[PDB]
């Protein structure tokens, strides 16, 4: 066939250029990121709640003495309470055998679904808890491998400056079916056991910054970053053990290094889920 096709398909081509121009316009945007940060900002998560925020997720907070705003995961219940979560454990995804600077600056990831493990910086925790007059409260939330959960609150929670190795202090245990492990535990070997396993007033320690009450290194041995005292009765930053139950034979140094809370479960029982979050005290009655 002569030119009865040198036109048929010369016209098709003009409509193609057209649809192609339409395609172009539909391919200018980036993939949709499911994780979004909310606009509300404040000194902490309670401050943000007080500002009408309604759901739990990622927000930027900027404590008083902070020079830079930083992202945190906020837990907002329907009751109008805003918890600032600073620690989280739920699967063995993130490694907690980190060094001083890593525990200081923070590690792990922050999700809006709160389904990710992490450690907010030691420095961030310090800036929030001591940012002003108002005292804070720390809630330790645990969960075993049987779906049962427990808690433990500590009044006047505060973490000191790095100059004082981020020392942990609290006024008094406020109750909770999980028991006061920060008070130490009577393991029965020596009468001084409960004393050397208490955490109130302890400095923070990592393998490369030993500030414990042990001649050896608790953080190096138990493999974590935590307020050691020769060494612990509460080890929420310990090795994540699948199953809960474990023995000293599965530990690298013979001592218990799992995520324990002696006043709720044996030391040879690592927790399944762990949460450490604070909230201005007056928020609890």
């Amino acid at each position: 066939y002569l030119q009865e096709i040198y036109n048929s398909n010369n016209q098709k081509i003009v409509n193609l250029k057209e649809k192609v121009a339409q395609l172009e316009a539909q391919c200018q945007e980036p993939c949709k990121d499911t994780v979004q940060i909310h606009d509300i900002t404040g000194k902490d998560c309670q401050d943000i709640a007080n500002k009408g925020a309604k759901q739990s997720g990622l927000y930027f907070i900027k404590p008083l003495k902070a020079n830079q705003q930083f992202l945190v995961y906020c837990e907002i219940d329907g009751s109008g309470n805003g918890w600032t979560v600073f620690q989280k454990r739920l699967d063995g995804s993130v490694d907690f055998k980190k060094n001083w600077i890593q525990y200081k600056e923070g590690f792990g990831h922050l999700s809006p679904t709160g389904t990710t493990e992490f450690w907010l910086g030691n420095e961030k925790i310090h800036l929030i808890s001591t940012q002003s007059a108002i005292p804070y409260a720390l809630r330790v939330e645990l969960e075993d491998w049987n779906g049962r959960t427990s808690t433990a609150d500590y009044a006047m929670f505060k973490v000191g400056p790095e100059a004082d190795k981020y020392r942990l202090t609290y006024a008094y245990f406020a109750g909770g079916d999980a028991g006061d492990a920060f008070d130490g535990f009577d393991f029965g070997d020596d009468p001084s056991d409960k004393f050397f396993t208490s955490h109130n007033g302890m400095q923070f320690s990592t393998w490369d910054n030993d500030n414990d009450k042990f001649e050896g290194n608790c953080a190096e041995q138990d493999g974590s970053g935590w307020w050691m005292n020769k060494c612990h009765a509460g080890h929420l930053n310990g090795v994540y053990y699948q199953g809960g139950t474990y023995s000293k034979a599965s530990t690298p140094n013979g001592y218990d290094n799992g995520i324990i809370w002696a006043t709720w479960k044996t030391r040879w029982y690592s927790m399944k889920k762990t949460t450490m979050k604070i909230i201005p005290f007056n928020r609890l009655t």
Binding site: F185, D193, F196, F214, R267
Partner: peptide, 4 residues
């Protein structure tokens, strides 16, 4: 835990 503790250090015997």
């Amino acid at each position: 835990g503790h250090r015997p």
